[PDB]
Structures are given as structure tokens and as C-alpha cells.
Amino acid sequence: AKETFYITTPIYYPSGNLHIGHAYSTVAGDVIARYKRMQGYDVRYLTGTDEHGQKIQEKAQKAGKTEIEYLDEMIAGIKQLWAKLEISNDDFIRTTEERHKHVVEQVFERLLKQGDIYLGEYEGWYSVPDETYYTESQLVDPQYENGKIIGGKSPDSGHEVELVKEESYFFNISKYTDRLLEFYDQNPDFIQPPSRKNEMINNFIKPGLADLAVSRTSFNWGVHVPSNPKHVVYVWIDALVNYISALGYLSDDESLFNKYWPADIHLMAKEIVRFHSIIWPILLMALDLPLPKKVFAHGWILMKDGKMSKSKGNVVDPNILIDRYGLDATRYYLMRELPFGSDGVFTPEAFVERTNFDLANDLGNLVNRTISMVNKYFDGELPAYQGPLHELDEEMEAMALETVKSYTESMESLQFSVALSTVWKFISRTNKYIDETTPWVLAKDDSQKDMLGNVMAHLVENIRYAAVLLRPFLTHAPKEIFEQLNINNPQFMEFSSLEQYGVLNESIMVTGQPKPIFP
Numbered sequence: 001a002k003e004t005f006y007i008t009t010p011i012y013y014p015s016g017n018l019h020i021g022h023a024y025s026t027v028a029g030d031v032i033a034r035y036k037r038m039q040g041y042d043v044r045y046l047t048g049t050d051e052h053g054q055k056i057q058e059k060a061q062k063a064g065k066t067e068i069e070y071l072d073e074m075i076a077g078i079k080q081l082w083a084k085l086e087i088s089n090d091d092f093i094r095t096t097e098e099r100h101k102h103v104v105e106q107v108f109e110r111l112l113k114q115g116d117i118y119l120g121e122y123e124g125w126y127s128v129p130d131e132t133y134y135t136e137s138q139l140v141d142p143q144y145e146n147g148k149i150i151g152g153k154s155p156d157s158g159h160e161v162e163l164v165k166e167e168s169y170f171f172n173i174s175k176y177t178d179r180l181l182e183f184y185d186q187n188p189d190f191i192q193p194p195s196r197k198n199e200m201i202n203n204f205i206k207p208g209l210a211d212l213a214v215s216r217t218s219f220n221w222g223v224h225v226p227s228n229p230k231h232v233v234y235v236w237i238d239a240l241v242n243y244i245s246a247l248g249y250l251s252d253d254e255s256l257f258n259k260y261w262p263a264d265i266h267l268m269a270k271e272i273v274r275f276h277s278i279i280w281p282i283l284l285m286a287l288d289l290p291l292p293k294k295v296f297a298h299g300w301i302l303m304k305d306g307k308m309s310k311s312k313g314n315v316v317d318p319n320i321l322i323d324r325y326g327l328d329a330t331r332y333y334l335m336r337e338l339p340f341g342s343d344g345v346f347t348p349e350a351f352v353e354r355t356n357f358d359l360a361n362d363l364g365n366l367v368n369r370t371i372s373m374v375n376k377y378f379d380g381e382l383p384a385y386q387g388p389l390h391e392l393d394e395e396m397e398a399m400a401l402e403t404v405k406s407y408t409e410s411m412e413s414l415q416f417s418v419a420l421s422t423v424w425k426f427i428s429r430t431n432k433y434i435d436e437t438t439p440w441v442l443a444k445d446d447s448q449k450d451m452l453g454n455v456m457a458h459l460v461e462n463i464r465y466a467a468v469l470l471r472p473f474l475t476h477a478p479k480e481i482f483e484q485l486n487i488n489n490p491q492f493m494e495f496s497s498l499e500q501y502g503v504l505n506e507s508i509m510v511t512g513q514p515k516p517i518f519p
């Protein structure tokens with residue numbers, strides 16, 4: 001059977017509209033999923049929404065709507081966005097669904113029964129503008145009384161914090177410390193790069209993992225603990241178990257869970273790596289479940305006032321980009337312009353240049369020039385590939401195969417910007433081959449009709465390579481390119497058809513009415 005590959009995005013918090021930051025993660029996961037399907041894996045790709053907590057209740061109440069009324073509307077918009085981006089997610093998990101809530105309940109009750117969780121009192125220091133709870137050691141300008149911290153200010157904003165106390169269940173995560181460090185040793189690529197792993201260990205694990213406050217009693221909008229109804233399960237357990245609840249864990253049908261768990265890749269931005277690389281494996285250990293194989297963290301899309309944030313309002317709406325510039329342009333920009341190992345600033349000027357110069361100009365003109373020449377010189381009948389007849393062909397056919405090899409290395413290491421630049425080196429060289437060979441000169445005399453046919457064959461086969469390699473990234477252009485070239489054999493759209501250059505060994509009738517590939 002096909003080997004399974006399970007990839008997840010984070011579940012997003014619908015306290016406001018999603019922005020291109022969210023689209024970046026979801027498109028990234030989609031490219032991985034599409035690539036793995038093309039490599040012959042049995043893929044499951046999950047995304048969804050994190051719907052509980054005070055902030056959601058507040059948003060709903062402000063809008064004059066019930067919590068579920070508010071959420072259903074937000075979720076409809078999120079699902080519409082993923083459909084518009086042509087995301088190939090196999091499921092959409094909502095934490096309000098009973099399939100999820102059942103797992104949250106059962107996990108919590110199991111940990112209580114085992115004694116991993118016990119009843120205590122949560123204490124935190126709340127800052128209104130930061131919407132954050134701090135520990136006493138994080139406070140700046142700490143005020144003391146009888147050798148005990150009684151007040152302070154937020155380290156982020158400097159706003160006066162307020163002491164909050166409430167009954168809360170705690171999960172003793174520190175018991176699992178040695179097992180977690182052992183796991184990191186046995187799985188050296190679980191967290192990357194090495195600096196990030198050291199970061200996790202030194203900042204959080206080393207000084208000692210504090211007990212984790214896994215319930216709250218001060219609000220009602222969440223999953224209630226069956227054995228103690230006045231407690232609601234907090235973010236840690238509720239959100240993290242989405243990755244297993246979506247697979248039917250602890251349901252009447254665990255077949256998806258039995259197949260796909262453990263996840264091959266959990267994808268996220270850097271700020272939630274700690275939760276996925278410490279809390280999540282510890283929770284899984286407490287449940288006697290296999291751990292995920294890899295946490296993949298990318299950087300932030302920034303604006304010129306910091307990280308793009310829906311609560312801040314410094315946002316770019318992907319719907320606006322798609323509506324104005326098209327889907328291929330939007331997906332291309334996200335994957336090409338913003339490497340995962342860096343934070344990058346969005347600008348409209350960079351978006352426009354990237355999509356006009358690379359898509360419409362470089363690739364789009366290559367296809368139109370090529371088809372136009374086939375129609376002009378051979379009345380639409382593309383001559384069959386024969387061999388490397390032109391002087392430049394040997395080296396260019398070698399470049400095609402090297403392009404596939406390099407691309408594969410980049411894709412395997414999740415260096416998508418590099419994979420794309422590598423494909424574009426080949427596209428640009430194919431345009432240069434038109435200029436070098438000057439087909440119009442060869443079309444002057446019937447003595448060169450054979451060589452002209454060879455040049456046309458090489459342009460089309462180069463285009464085919466590019467189109468196949470772009471199938472994980474672009475959902476419209478490759479299909480359109482195959483349709484205009486009238487390559488109908490589904491096999492010639494797959495990676496295996498790139499092993500040996502020159503598959504089109506019969507003549508084909510290209511389109512007589514070519515049209516722009518983009519937008």
C-alpha cells in the first residue's frame with residue numbers, strides 16, 4: 001500500500017478575519033500535501049478552527065449574536081477563503097463539534113483518573129491592552145510587600161497588571177521532562193534548526209516546567225469537565241487534541257486515527273513551537289500515544305509596524321489579492337517571496353513585480369511564443385521529439401534533469417522559495433533558447449524544417465517539465481498549459497514522466513486559439 005503522510009496547520013482563532021499570515025501557513029501545508037500526493041503518498045491534510053474561550057464570547061456578545069451564530073458566520077468565511085485558495089484539505093476540524101468535544105472530555109477525565117491532573121488555584125497577572133496573563137517573574141518594576149510580589153507592570157507594553165486567582169486543574173508536566181529530552185535525542189530533526197531546539201531546552205525545560213493550568217472556572221464558553229461541570233477545559237488540551245480528534249480518536253470509528261497518527265508534520269509559525277514541541281509531546285506521553293515526527297515552524301509576514309496581526313489591524317486580506325490579481329499570483333507570491341526561515345515584509349510593489357515579471361512575462365510569454373510558432377510554422381502540428389539535434393540540446397536536456405533533481409532536494413527540505421527560483425532559472429533559459437536558435441531564420445528554407453521541428457519539440461518539452469514541477473504550487477496554470485499544448489495523457493503530468501527527456505514521440509495538434517495563461 002501507499003505510505004501515509006499526515007500534515008496539519010494550526011487551528012486558527014476566529015476572533016477576527018484571517019489575513020495573508022493565515023493564508024501563508026495554509027498554502028504552505030497545501031503545497032506539501034500536493035507534492036506528497038504527486039510522490040505517491042496516501043495524504044491527509046487537516047486544518048480548522050479553535051472556537052472556545054472568553055475572547056470569542058466577547059466578540060459574539062459585542063456583535064449581538066450567540067456564540068455559535070457568530071462562529072458559524074466566521075467559519076463560513078474561512079471555508080470560503082480555503083475554497084477560493086483551492087486548498088486540498090481533507091477535513092476541517094471545529095472545536096465546537098461533538099467529535100472534538102468528546103475527545104477533550106475523555107482525555108481530561110483520563111488524566112484526572114491517572115492522577116496527572118489535580119485541583120489547585122491558578123494565579124496570574126493580567127494586562128488589559130496586552131490581553132495576556134504574565135507570571136510574577138515576568139513583571140517589570142515589581143512591587144513587594146513582606147517579601148512577596150504584590151504588583152507590577154507588563155514587560156511588553158508597560159501597563160499596570162492586575163492579580164487574578166481562580167480554582168483550576170493542573171497537569172504535572174515536569175514528571176515527563178527526562179522522557180521528553182530522551183525523545184529529542186532519539187529524534188534530532190523533530191525541532192529545527194539546532195538553535196531552536198536549544199532555545200526550547202534552555203529557556204523553558206531547563207529552569208523547570210511549571211505545572212500547567214489546564215482548566216478555568218471564571219467563564220463558561222468552552223468544553224466542561226464531566227466530573228466537575230463548573231470547570232472549562234483551557235486552550236492547552238482543547239486546541240492540541242484537534243490533531244487526533246479529527247481522525248476519530250475515541251469515537252465509534254478510529255480507522256483514520258489508526259492509519260494517519262502520528263503526524264508527519266505539524267506546521268505553524270514560530271510563536272507556538274514551544275506548545276507543540278513541549279506540551280503536546282508530554283500530553284501524548286500521558287495518553288500512551290505515539291509522538292509526531294516533526295514540528296515545522298516558519299517565520300512571520302510583517303508590515304511596517306511589526307508582525308501582521310488580526311487584533312492589531314495591520315492586515316492584508318487574501319480575498320482582495322485573489323480578486324484583483326488572481327489565485328496563481330497570490331499562491332506564487334506567498335511561496336516565492338517569503339522563505340520559511342526568515343521574517344519578511346509584505347509590500348504591494350513586491351507582489352506586483354513578482355507576479356507580473358515571473359508569471360505573466362516569463363512563463364506566460366514563453367507558452368504563447370511557443371504555441372504561436374507551432375501554429376505559424378507547422379499549422380498546429382507539433383513535430384515529435386526525436387533526439388538532441390541542435391548543438392545546445394545536450395546541455396539543455398541535462399539542465400532539465402538537473403532542474404528536477406535540485407527542485408526535489410529543495411522540496412524535501414521545505415525550501416520552497418529555492419525550488420521556485422530553480423524552476424524559473426529553467427523557464428528563463430527556455431525563453432533564451434528561442435533567442436539563441438532564432439526559429440524564424442530556420443523557417444526560411446525547407447532544408448531546415450527538421451531542425452525547426454526539433455527546436456519546437458524542445459520548447460514544448462521544457463514547458464511540460466516546468467508545468468509538472470509547478471503542480472504543487474499553482475492550481476490553474478499547469479492545467480491550462482497542458483490544455484493549450486493538447487497533452488491529454490494524464491501520465492505526462494506526473495513526476496515519473498520527467499525521468500527521461502522527450503516523452504512526446506508522436507505528433508500533437510496544439511490549440512489554434514492560444515490565450516493568456518495568466519491571470
Ligand SMILES: N=C(NCCCCCCNC(=N)NC(=N)Nc1ccc(Cl)cc1)NC(=N)Nc1ccc(Cl)cc1
Binds near residue numbers: 050052222233234239
Ligand atoms: N487565543 C487564545 N488565547 C489564550 C491562549 C493562552 C496563552 C497564550 C500563549 N501565547 C500565544 N501566542 N498563544 C496563541 N496565540 N495561541 C495558542 C495556540 C496553541 C496553543 Cl496549544 C496555545 C495557545 N486562546 C485560544 N486560541 N484558544 C482557547 C481555547 C479554549 C479556551 Cl477555554 C480558551 C482559549
Ligand SMILES: Nc1ncnc2c1ncn2[C@@H]1O[C@H](COP(=O)(O)OP(=O)(O)OP(=O)(O)O)[C@@H](O)[C@H]1O
Binds near residue numbers: 010012021022300301
Ligand atoms: N503574520 C503571520 N505570519 C505568518 N504566519 C501567521 C501570521 N499570523 C498568523 N499566522 C499563522 O496563524 C497561526 C496563528 O496565529 P494567530 O492567529 O494567533 O496570529 P494573529 O493574527 O497575530 O492573531 P491575534 O491578532 O489574535 O493575536 C500561526 O501559528 C501561523 O500559522
